[PDB]
């Protein structure tokens, strides 16, 4: 907003947009999108039923779209470098890159940016360095606790 | 729409969800979190059915039927094995933490959770771990709290908050420690908190008044009666046991009071069980009180009446139509006096003239919820007609309903409706002498004297229609608010104007009639509602007669030497000193009453009348609907020395013994036919209920359930020989189980709801054609008058502004739901709930007198210096003093009355 | 007896400026009261209710719903050890045992002087550096049981 990128008359186009940061109070169910809308309204984070979708009536009965941080991070890359660049990142049905990484008693527990279609053994061996010393691999969860 | 349930075709309404459509067809789907009045939220997951995409589908999918619309060509299955196993699993998961409490729980035999545990066929416990527990809160004198029994169905919070508008009940906690209650211990603030005992499907919220003298539902004797605590006329089921009134359940009337009562009706029944009630006729002989039976009391009373030269009768709005008519027949039409003040009778007659001659349709209580704008003029409905306030809240939420319907959201998906309609609501404009309980949802609240409220109404009528008389002296900001009201009411498809006789002002009713006429002239679908004071106020107004002041002058001048007072204490309608002087001057006072009143000290004869629980009769409610209430129990069954008859029976036998020197304990239908023949305006009360010859395939209607217990032991302490069953010649009901209470029986009067497998209040679903709709074969009750073709004229009597004059003090009425009704005051459980009487004063007036908040001031009216402690009322207008009406010594005839000698004690 | 301060009321009203409905500032109002006074007392619910124009039952339900809004008195410092799955893999149980040995309490309650209170918490979003522990404003990673006395001695 100091540089005019947010607020009234952004970039001289007449478009007004105000961005706020709402810090949560520590509950896991608040990540659910309708429950996120409910907790944004200062209510208990009970999720809502669909239909109606949040696009029809979400936050305070208004049209509302909820998106992840990473999706809104790939949005500027699409809008800057082009669409046909984004479809040609990987030869997979899931276009674009993704933040992947193995964690838990491995040699290199971290996070890297890989195209879709990368096999899980590549992330474990070529990036995480495999398991730690004297540990036999038993199982793995691809996408967290759920 | 067309659905296919278990391979069988059904024709339903497409706007309903699947659960209510299937319950309307007689199919049994277990459910907890859905209610016909509250909508669907899909919490409890009990209503699961299996839905298929088409007829040639085998896999299907589990869906919640309460959240699934009953669209055309919808293929489902209830008796699918997977759906049955899931419903059993839901009941089992609810049963893992449930306390081993059924023998010591007041909901046993009336429990929806018991019914659905049995209905799912779940009876083997494979859970071996610990069960969670909770502390209980104190919710006041009415509702008992037991949080262990909760199943987290969220019905209480949805009803109390989204429906009733209450604020102090809520859901706290988290994952499996969800708590339902108040944030701290204290009385539930809502006037409709008592419906939680029927909303809650478990034993969390229970009737504490019933829990004192608890008995199970199969042990009750029920009757279909009408609540006697105000003029709305809500249908109730009084249930008794061992000769005392035990409980008041809601009785479903789809036209009036469908699922909900108010707390005054539900809990103010304790006056029936008072031990100082008259149970035998008592004659005064010097200082001796001789107890008589029926025959000798009738003989002596008729002899003394025959030696008298003129007998006058003083009726009451508490008494039924038949008893008032019987008194009118006994004393003569010209000698019959309605036992209300001249101003009260004038306001009542004007309200009746507006209702049955104004050409504007008066809605039923259920139909109020469909109006688009509400203007309440001078009537504190939450304290006088509370169910009208609940219906007004529903009509206010109608705007959110319409906004959701504009987005193609179904009417049963209540969460989406409340989400779309965030705070947008239909316009509500309430006027009172102070703040009302509808101010949280009112678009505007006008705190002003009754003359100023009437002037506001006349200004609204003038701005809506220039033919109406104008008001001179309107402030510009008041004119702007009047214009806001005018554009809100003119833009409404169905405006509703509510007023009543409790304001104590004729001009308020005249202004409301003017507003309704102005809206009618513009082509709007306007409705008008008038809130009376007592249960049969409209019936007494239709019957007519003189005022109480005329009867008092007749007693004082010596023209009348005999007075028969029917169900009237005479102190709520006139000054106590003048009433006592007139009754002491009269050589014969005969009080036919069921409550120990103060006028029986000087009464020569006291006839032990029956209350509503021990009598039959007809009552006309505030919208002019005749409703028949039936006797619940015979008072002579347990105490054989009790001579307690109907008031119309007493007066008809007195008339017969006065004429032919012979008693005649008549029948109810004879008195009904006499009313219909003599009074053509009350000709509709014949059709309120069928006569005593009405049968369902040759058998009567049962008052008690099939499993009524202890029939050879309840009276065994008196005598081991079983007494004769009490015969009911007046009505079609029997004082036994030997009768019909089938939900498919062709009748409208239903004493209680019970179907096999449905022992809870959810059996009313079985007793309706569609759930949440009307009673099958029609709701009981008949409107007396139709809407007139031509209306009245504009009332040109526009009052002047309220002028605060020194020395005088205008009494502003402050009604209380617990304390303004006389019989409700007599109930012992209301004494803790009712507040200490506070005299309400403006801060400016209290500074003028120098009195602070809490100090006692003494004032004299009719030579009676009484003292009250001061409460400061900021919303009151200076020059007015607020008085709580109906309380100890403060009669309701003080509304609009001046006051002298307001000084600090 | 609970009186809101002027700074608390100003911050609460400034948070009400950010939304189109004053109810939406209930979580931040409770967090402001908790940050100023350590926790949220019983009168704070009614004070926030009168400020925001929403019923006290709603504020109580919000305060009891969320785990980080404390409705009981806590110590001057809060230990929040992550009990989730990745820190369980990296051995949070030794960290919890060391904390129970040092504080000489069970999780959930407070020390006799109110110096620390111990709380099992959700996943802190630092699973690649597990196990993790949150003191009042500071996150700590790569925990060892021997580092508990030297880490807890810097919080008085
Ligand atoms: C229990 C539960 C927790 C969730 N937590 C998160 C979360 O923490 N962050 C997140 O981005 N999505 C979370 N989601 C997914 C959201 O519902 C939603 O899909 C997402 O936030 C936005 O969708 P998007 O991936 O297209 O941006 C959660 C879903 C569920 C059912
Ligand atoms: S609520 Fe119902 S199931 Fe629970 S203890 Fe009471 S009667 Fe039994
Ligand atoms: S207290 Fe009763 S109505 Fe409320 S959620 Fe629990 S079971 Fe349902
Ligand atoms: S609104 Fe009136 S008639 Fe209805 S339950 Fe209450 S007191 Fe009885
Ligand atoms: S009745 Fe449908 S889920 Fe509760
Ligand atoms: S599992 Fe502990 S920080 Fe995520
Ligand atoms: Ca009878």
mmCIF file of C-alpha atoms and ligand atoms in Angstrom, chain B residues 32-33 98 113 132 145-147 149-159 169-171 178-181 196 198-205, ligand 3:
data_model
loop_
_atom_site.group_PDB
_atom_site.id
_atom_site.type_symbol
_atom_site.label_atom_id
_atom_site.label_comp_id
_atom_site.label_asym_id
_atom_site.label_seq_id
_atom_site.Cartn_x
_atom_site.Cartn_y
_atom_site.Cartn_z
ATOM 1 C CA UNK B 32 -32.494 -36.673 16.111
ATOM 2 C CA UNK B 33 -31.220 -33.298 14.904
ATOM 3 C CA UNK B 98 -24.937 -42.299 27.702
ATOM 4 C CA UNK B 113 -33.621 -41.403 22.274
ATOM 5 C CA UNK B 132 -17.733 -39.000 29.659
ATOM 6 C CA UNK B 145 -30.344 -29.561 33.594
ATOM 7 C CA UNK B 146 -28.693 -32.981 33.176
ATOM 8 C CA UNK B 147 -25.811 -32.707 30.730
ATOM 9 C CA UNK B 149 -27.812 -37.425 28.844
ATOM 10 C CA UNK B 150 -26.934 -35.197 25.880
ATOM 11 C CA UNK B 151 -26.383 -36.635 22.413
ATOM 12 C CA UNK B 152 -25.151 -33.341 20.866
ATOM 13 C CA UNK B 153 -28.065 -33.017 18.456
ATOM 14 C CA UNK B 154 -27.970 -29.173 18.661
ATOM 15 C CA UNK B 155 -31.772 -28.833 18.783
ATOM 16 C CA UNK B 156 -31.700 -26.722 21.948
ATOM 17 C CA UNK B 157 -29.282 -24.114 20.627
ATOM 18 C CA UNK B 158 -31.000 -23.921 17.235
ATOM 19 C CA UNK B 159 -34.438 -23.473 18.813
ATOM 20 C CA UNK B 169 -28.146 -20.542 25.895
ATOM 21 C CA UNK B 170 -25.336 -21.812 23.719
ATOM 22 C CA UNK B 171 -22.892 -24.554 22.821
ATOM 23 C CA UNK B 178 -19.620 -30.183 23.714
ATOM 24 C CA UNK B 179 -21.645 -28.497 26.454
ATOM 25 C CA UNK B 180 -25.128 -27.045 25.997
ATOM 26 C CA UNK B 181 -26.250 -24.469 28.525
ATOM 27 C CA UNK B 196 -36.755 -27.025 25.538
ATOM 28 C CA UNK B 198 -40.029 -31.028 24.247
ATOM 29 C CA UNK B 199 -37.330 -29.845 21.840
ATOM 30 C CA UNK B 200 -34.620 -31.859 23.617
ATOM 31 C CA UNK B 201 -34.904 -35.522 22.532
ATOM 32 C CA UNK B 202 -33.205 -36.673 25.763
ATOM 33 C CA UNK B 203 -33.396 -35.914 29.475
ATOM 34 C CA UNK B 204 -31.074 -32.907 29.545
ATOM 35 C CA UNK B 205 -33.794 -30.264 29.806
HETATM 36 S S1 LIG D 3 -29.111 -30.814 25.286
HETATM 37 FE FE1 LIG D 3 -30.783 -31.998 24.233
HETATM 38 S S2 LIG D 3 -31.449 -30.654 22.498
HETATM 39 FE FE2 LIG D 3 -29.388 -29.918 23.188
HETATM 40 S S3 LIG D 3 -27.888 -30.990 21.809
HETATM 41 FE FE3 LIG D 3 -28.110 -32.202 23.750
HETATM 42 S S4 LIG D 3 -29.711 -33.787 23.258
HETATM 43 FE FE4 LIG D 3 -29.890 -32.120 21.682
#
